[PDB]
Symmetry: C3
Subunit: 261 residues, 3 copies
């Protein structure tokens, strides 16, 4: 029976939690203003497809993070027997409440932002339509099963099963990035920039399943506030700096990526 | 602990509310029939695409309004401190429940129908895929953040912040409609009808955020029943008469949009 | 009612558990088999058809897990006049009014059918318009079905949603059986549609018939049988049907390539 306001106040009044959240609303807002400014000189429709898709990353981010900060996409959940976070309580409103303050809203940010990042990368890599579809479908699957795992409270073993499935989907995304697009970029004339962003993406994305396993949703070594900053830190690199680097290139090489959408 | 049934009964026994909802279900059904009939002569695959995108609007609208009228997509929400509708009470079942009956289902109508309208306008204007993608993504973000604000009860300020993000998204969609597509239509040879459809669209679309701000979701100068009829009036112009006007042109100019 | 209690309800109930854990297992094995069968495709258009088909059992293993875990199950009280009114079922160790409702099934369908449809549409040389029409109405079919299963305000609303969904059903079956059979002639794939013609009509029609008959509709079938009839179809539609599509595609890569 925890209200949204109660959760909104718990975030505020919790400097660790509030900061990892409000800082991204802020940074997402700046990225947007900056990116629109950087890209206002493009003309080719294909280059502009790469631009709006990249720019949509922080748009999704600022909206979703507002979802978290407002308490709209945060619920309190009790972990199943054997779960390392079973036995937690949090004090909400003015009483102790069993459960863990669960930021499931992060999965909405991901399910809606990762496909935009893959879209921009695939296009930059000159990918055909089959590889984009494969990458984006499995990536979405990865995010949805991740959310399903966080949301599962009936069985501790069930949680880790969703997690495994999500990992399998993640492998498909990684194979496309590391094996297929790495080569398609040579044919597209963007071998080096793609390779840079390919590494950045792979290194950063691998951080998420580790944080999940280590954070409150998993082994619980990282309490709620900390698992949150871990995710917020990854987001800043995987979303904002990534986009900046991608747009920095596109904004100086419009002609290399230009052509039929 | 309000049930779907009590909401279903609350809509009934409420003049303005039931009528503004049940009227749209009826006009949507009659619209679908009239539109199918109007477009039975189409043969060009591209004109048909425009025809079906358009028809999907009243389809979305009848299914969604049935969602509201049935209570499935309605909820009772307590507004935050400072909100003009906080402190409100509503008679549901056998008590005086705290809150405001929230027609959150409306945003499901706008999120699913507006992308179809936009798909209809962009194809008609000869728009390339980049602008359709832009117009449609920011349109979806617009409707979903609008839904987020309506669903926010934690803080009054947050409600107006979501409202702000939703309006910014609205501005992008508008720019494409009035500055980009308006110009693309010339190449497409559909400049005249696009103006008409563009004009009606922008003015009607502007009505929604205005209604939001003045109704129970905003400063509540308009009561629940009244905001509902305001949204219903608008849906009638932007969903049915607008769709009719588009199909009327299309069915008399198939060759122009050929593809 | 609790998620664990819904989860224990399915487990411990042989009929329910087997209709769910069998799909998870068969989907898991189907994904592996499908990926293996398609390891040789070289053409991009063919690859699109294959991954679009492979996603079918991917969606299935996730959604069924969604049901088996209790996440996508709920307990709803049917409205006055509904044949399942007055039902109770024992969940927290006590008597609970209502019917355990597997609404997760509509998620399974809303997410997997667009996928088999795009695979069949492409296979049929369909243009973009018929593909859009098929998928949009198909998704409208599943969403309105879910709405019907979720409506408790009145028994009448439920059937009205059902009619809306059935209307969408025919728009879809039409293009599948008629339109694409024809388009497939130019594509050189009329045969796969001709051979699977009866399989298609029967399995697709089987869903609205199970609805009307099961606890969601007139309820001549209890919950456990309502689940197995849906799960019997899913096995046909999601695994055997996808296999046949893939067996064909793999032997006819060249032609589907164009
Ligand atoms: C909340 C907030 C700011 C929100 C800002 C928004 C929503 C701006 C979106 C801008 C877009 C989409 C611009 C499109 C151009 C291309 C236009 C097009 C292809 C559509 O013609 C281009 C060249 C990429 O800048 C701040 C605090
Ligand atoms: C850029 C996003 C803008 C949103 C900023 C949110 C910060 C405002 C928080 O408000 C305060 O919250 C307290 C706890 O509920 C109330 O006690 C107090 O009266 C209210 O004023
Ligand atoms: C490589 C991924 C590693 C994930 C391994 C998941 C193992 C977690 C098992 O959970 C435990 O299962 C028992 C039997 O069901 C329950 O009795 C117990 O309460 C529950 O805590
Ligand atoms: C052969 C692998 C298939 C795995 C299927 C997942 C089901 C896991 C069931 O675990 C059991 O759930 C009970 C609650 O219902 C707990 O009370 C019990 O302690 C726990 O051990
Ligand atoms: C902008 C956000 C980004 C780049 C998010 C990426 C998220 C992932 C790669 C998440 C992956 C996960 C798994 C592979 C296992 C299950 C848990 C998840 C969801 C954290
Ligand atoms: C169903 C048809 C139409 C044309 C719907 C249009 C809806 C909008 C233009 C909604 C806009 C909103 C904004 C910009 C701000 C917050 C609240 C709204 C969701 C109402
Ligand atoms: C998973 C594969 C297939 C082919 C699923 C098909 C599903 C349907 C044909 C569902 C149809 C329904 C109708 C027409 C009426 C209301 C309820 C349903 C959603 C069951």
């Amino acid at each position: 029976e925890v209200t949204q306001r109660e959760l909104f106040e718990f975030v505020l009044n919790d400097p660790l939690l509030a900061s990892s959240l409000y800082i991204n609303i802020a940074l997402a807002g700046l990225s947007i203003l900056l990116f629109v400014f950087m890209t206002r000189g493009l003309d080719d429709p294909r280059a502009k497809l790469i631009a709006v898709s990249t720019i949509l990353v922080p748009v999704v981010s600022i909206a979703s993070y507002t979802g978290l900060a407002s308490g709209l996409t945060i619920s309190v959940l009790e972990m199943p027997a054997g779960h390392f976070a079973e036995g937690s309580s949090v004090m909400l409103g003015g009483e102790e409440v069993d459960g863990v303050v669960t930021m499931w809203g992060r999965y909405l940010t991901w399910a809606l932002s990762t496909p935009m990042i893959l879209l921009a990368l695939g296009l930059l890599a000159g990918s055909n339509a089959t590889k984009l579809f494969t990458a984006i479908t499995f990536d979405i699957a990865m995010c949805v099963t991740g959310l399903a795992a966080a949301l599962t409270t009936s069985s501790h073993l069930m949680r880790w099963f969703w997690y495994a499935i999500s990992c399998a989907c993640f492998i498909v995304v990684l194979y496309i990035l590391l094996v297929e697009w790495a080569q398609d970029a040579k044919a597209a004339g963007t071998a080096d920039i793609f390779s840079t962003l390919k590494l950045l993406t792979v290194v950063m994305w691998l951080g998420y399943p580790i944080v999940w396993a280590l954070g409150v949703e998993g082994v619980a070594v990282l309490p709620v506030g900390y698992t949150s900053w871990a995710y917020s830190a990854l987001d800043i690199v995987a979303k904002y700096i990534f986009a900046f680097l991608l747009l920095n290139y596109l904004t100086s090489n419009e002609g290399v990526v230009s052509g039929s959408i």
